[PDB]
Design a protein around this motif. Sequence first.
Motif, PDB file in Angstrom:
ATOM      1  N   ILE A  39      23.620  35.613  24.249  1.00  5.66           N
ATOM      2  CA  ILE A  39      23.784  36.499  25.391  1.00  5.66           C
ATOM      3  C   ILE A  39      24.745  35.837  26.364  1.00  5.66           C
ATOM      4  CG2 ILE A  39      21.619  35.556  26.251  1.00  5.66           C
ATOM      5  CD1 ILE A  39      21.428  37.727  28.199  1.00  5.66           C
ATOM      6  N   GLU A  40      25.801  36.551  26.736  1.00 12.85           N
ATOM      7  CA  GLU A  40      26.722  36.081  27.757  1.00 12.85           C
ATOM      8  C   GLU A  40      26.977  37.205  28.744  1.00 12.85           C
ATOM      9  OE1 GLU A  40      30.874  35.630  27.422  1.00 12.85           O
ATOM     10  OE2 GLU A  40      30.978  36.494  25.410  1.00 12.85           O
ATOM     11  N   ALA A  41      27.158  36.840  30.006  1.00 16.59           N
ATOM     12  CA  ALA A  41      27.291  37.799  31.087  1.00 16.59           C
ATOM     13  C   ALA A  41      28.566  37.523  31.866  1.00 16.59           C
ATOM     14  CB  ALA A  41      26.089  37.744  32.026  1.00 16.59           C
ATOM     15  N   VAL A  42      29.121  38.577  32.452  1.00 11.79           N
ATOM     16  CA  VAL A  42      30.378  38.517  33.181  1.00 11.79           C
ATOM     17  C   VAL A  42      30.135  39.060  34.578  1.00 11.79           C
ATOM     18  CG1 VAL A  42      32.670  39.483  33.359  1.00 11.79           C
ATOM     19  CG2 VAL A  42      31.869  38.619  31.187  1.00 11.79           C
ATOM     20  N   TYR A  43      30.133  38.179  35.568  1.00 15.45           N
ATOM     21  CA  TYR A  43      29.901  38.568  36.948  1.00 15.45           C
ATOM     22  C   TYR A  43      31.217  38.867  37.648  1.00 15.45           C
ATOM     23  CZ  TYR A  43      25.059  37.132  36.576  1.00 15.45           C
ATOM     24  OH  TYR A  43      23.743  37.020  36.211  1.00 15.45           O
ATOM     25  N   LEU A  44      31.129  39.660  38.712  1.00 13.55           N
ATOM     26  CA  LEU A  44      32.309  40.049  39.471  1.00 13.55           C
ATOM     27  C   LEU A  44      31.901  40.612  40.822  1.00 13.55           C
ATOM     28  CD1 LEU A  44      34.364  42.711  40.143  1.00 13.55           C
ATOM     29  CD2 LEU A  44      35.218  40.390  39.887  1.00 13.55           C
TER      30      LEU A  44
ATOM     31  N   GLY B 229      34.251  33.225  42.488  1.00 12.50           N
ATOM     32  CA  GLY B 229      35.137  32.197  42.001  1.00 12.50           C
ATOM     33  C   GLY B 229      36.582  32.638  42.115  1.00 12.50           C
ATOM     34  N   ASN B 230      37.474  31.668  41.957  1.00  9.69           N
ATOM     35  CA  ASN B 230      38.904  31.917  42.024  1.00  9.69           C
ATOM     36  C   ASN B 230      39.608  30.821  41.238  1.00  9.69           C
ATOM     37  OD1 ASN B 230      39.827  29.842  44.402  1.00  9.69           O
ATOM     38  ND2 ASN B 230      37.805  30.722  44.803  1.00  9.69           N
ATOM     39  N   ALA B 231      40.929  30.734  41.407  1.00 13.37           N
ATOM     40  CA  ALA B 231      41.701  29.744  40.665  1.00 13.37           C
ATOM     41  C   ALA B 231      41.263  28.326  40.994  1.00 13.37           C
ATOM     42  CB  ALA B 231      43.189  29.919  40.955  1.00 13.37           C
TER      43      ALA B 231
ATOM     44  N   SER C 204      34.995  37.385  46.410  1.00 15.95           N
ATOM     45  CA  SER C 204      34.850  36.893  45.051  1.00 15.95           C
ATOM     46  C   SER C 204      34.103  35.570  45.040  1.00 15.95           C
ATOM     47  CB  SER C 204      36.220  36.730  44.401  1.00 15.95           C
ATOM     48  OG  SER C 204      37.022  35.834  45.147  1.00 15.95           O
TER      49      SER C 204
ATOM     50  N   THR D 292      39.032  34.086  34.991  1.00 13.38           N
ATOM     51  CA  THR D 292      38.559  33.192  36.043  1.00 13.38           C
ATOM     52  C   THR D 292      39.457  33.253  37.270  1.00 13.38           C
ATOM     53  OG1 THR D 292      37.603  31.731  34.380  1.00 13.38           O
ATOM     54  CG2 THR D 292      37.913  30.846  36.589  1.00 13.38           C
ATOM     55  N   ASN D 293      40.773  33.312  37.068  1.00 13.35           N
ATOM     56  CA  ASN D 293      41.679  33.409  38.207  1.00 13.35           C
ATOM     57  C   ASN D 293      41.494  34.725  38.947  1.00 13.35           C
ATOM     58  OD1 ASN D 293      42.575  30.976  37.291  1.00 13.35           O
ATOM     59  ND2 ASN D 293      44.722  31.578  37.071  1.00 13.35           N
ATOM     60  N   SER D 294      41.073  35.771  38.235  1.00 12.04           N
ATOM     61  CA  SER D 294      40.882  37.071  38.866  1.00 12.04           C
ATOM     62  C   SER D 294      39.787  37.019  39.919  1.00 12.04           C
ATOM     63  CB  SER D 294      40.548  38.117  37.806  1.00 12.04           C
ATOM     64  OG  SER D 294      40.064  39.305  38.403  1.00 12.04           O
ATOM     65  N   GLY D 295      38.702  36.316  39.631  1.00 13.18           N
ATOM     66  CA  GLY D 295      37.544  36.303  40.499  1.00 13.18           C
ATOM     67  C   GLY D 295      36.285  36.476  39.685  1.00 13.18           C
ATOM     68  N   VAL D 296      36.465  36.875  38.426  1.00 15.90           N
ATOM     69  CA  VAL D 296      35.341  37.011  37.514  1.00 15.90           C
ATOM     70  C   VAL D 296      34.714  35.649  37.277  1.00 15.90           C
ATOM     71  CG1 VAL D 296      34.846  37.337  35.090  1.00 15.90           C
ATOM     72  CG2 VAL D 296      35.938  39.151  36.365  1.00 15.90           C
ATOM     73  N   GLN D 297      33.391  35.607  37.300  1.00 17.58           N
ATOM     74  CA  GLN D 297      32.634  34.373  37.142  1.00 17.58           C
ATOM     75  C   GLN D 297      31.925  34.433  35.795  1.00 17.58           C
ATOM     76  OE1 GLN D 297      29.817  33.659  40.230  1.00 17.58           O
ATOM     77  NE2 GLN D 297      30.243  31.457  40.314  1.00 17.58           N
ATOM     78  N   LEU D 298      32.510  33.787  34.792  1.00 17.99           N
ATOM     79  CA  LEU D 298      31.968  33.840  33.446  1.00 17.99           C
ATOM     80  C   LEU D 298      30.692  33.015  33.344  1.00 17.99           C
ATOM     81  CD1 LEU D 298      35.255  33.521  31.413  1.00 17.99           C
ATOM     82  CD2 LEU D 298      33.886  35.551  31.767  1.00 17.99           C
ATOM     83  N   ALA D 299      29.891  33.332  32.332  1.00 20.51           N
ATOM     84  CA  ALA D 299      28.650  32.621  32.059  1.00 20.51           C
ATOM     85  C   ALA D 299      28.376  32.706  30.566  1.00 20.51           C
ATOM     86  CB  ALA D 299      27.498  33.198  32.887  1.00 20.51           C
ATOM     87  N   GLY D 300      27.173  32.312  30.168  1.00 19.53           N
ATOM     88  CA  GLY D 300      26.747  32.434  28.786  1.00 19.53           C
ATOM     89  C   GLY D 300      27.643  31.749  27.773  1.00 19.53           C
TER      90      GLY D 300
ATOM     91  N   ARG E  18      35.847  30.265  22.041  1.00 20.36           N
ATOM     92  CA  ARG E  18      36.467  30.837  23.226  1.00 20.36           C
ATOM     93  C   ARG E  18      37.897  31.287  22.954  1.00 20.36           C
ATOM     94  NH1 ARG E  18      31.638  31.694  24.856  1.00 20.36           N
ATOM     95  NH2 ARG E  18      30.454  29.751  25.128  1.00 20.36           N
TER      96      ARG E  18
END
Lengths: 53, 50
Positions: free
Chosen positions: B34-39, B46-48, B44, A45-53, A36
Amino acid sequence: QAAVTSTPRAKLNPRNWPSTLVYQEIPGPTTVLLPRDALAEVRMTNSGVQLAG
Amino acid sequence: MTFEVDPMDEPTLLYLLFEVFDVVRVHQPHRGVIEAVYLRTPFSAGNATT
């Protein structure tokens, strides 16, 4: 044979062998590839993006 | 918002949905990874805090 191989000692069968005279297994340095990025995933993550994988 | 509706008998919901942008980028760099990035932009996921 003894001269050729045996370690010169002042005492046959010592009760304890010094660190110098004992075969020490010395493996090579172990490299790790850190997966990472510490700061990047915090920013996303703070932006709102929800990481995965 | 303040909706005004007809007074029917049986209890009902309202089911209001806000139209948003939700997307995902799927990056697979290595064989078997495989990794994915949701938005989701306005609401939103997720957040802080999360």
